[PDB]
Amino acid sequence: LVSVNTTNRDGQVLANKVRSTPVAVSTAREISLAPVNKLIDDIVKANAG
Amino acid sequence: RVPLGNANLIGREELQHARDAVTSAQAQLDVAIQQYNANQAMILGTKLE
């Protein structure tokens, strides 16, 4: 049950501001490729002689 | 042929030709060896499977 005050009505009805900061950033599910690079180096070294 | 030339019993062009023949044979052998090595790069001495 919500009761909203209206005594002060200095007009601002539609938002008119921007911000350079995101909302709800999620980083999990971003993979680091180091181990696969190590595997690739190992494979390349084995077939060069 | 070298000893005869040492005593000056053959022309010097004959010695030059023989020495150049030795060098050319060496170069041809090098070509053959490198060809064989190139072929062996695709096997690397591993079993068939």
DSSP track, A16-40: ----SS-SS---TTPPP-HHHHHHH
Distances in whole angstroms, Cα of residue B38 to Cα of each of B32, B43, B47: 10, 10, 19
Q: Which phi and psi (to 5°) does residue B13 adopt? A: -65, -30
Place of tokens 């023989």: B18
Contact B4, B10 (CB under 8 A): yes
Q: Is A49 within 8 Å of B46 (Cβ atoms)?
A: no
C-alpha span between B31 and B25 (Å, rounded) = 10
> Which of A4-26 are b and which e, b meaning 16 or more Cβ less than 10 Å from the residue's Cβ?
eeeeeeeeeeeeeeeeeeeeeee
Using only C-alpha atoms, what is the Rg of chain B? Answer: 20
H helix or E strand, kind and range, residue B38:
helix B12-40
Residues just before a chain gap in chain B (C–N exceeding 2.5 Å) are none
Question: Do B33 and B43 meet the contact criterion of CB atoms below 8 Å apart?
Answer: no
- Closest to A43 (Cα-Cα) out of B35, B48, B44: B44
Place of tokens 């690739």: A40
CA dihedral A35, A40, A42, A47 (to 10 degrees): 170
Gyration radius of chain A over CA positions:
28
Question: In Å, what resolution does this model reach?
Answer: 3.1
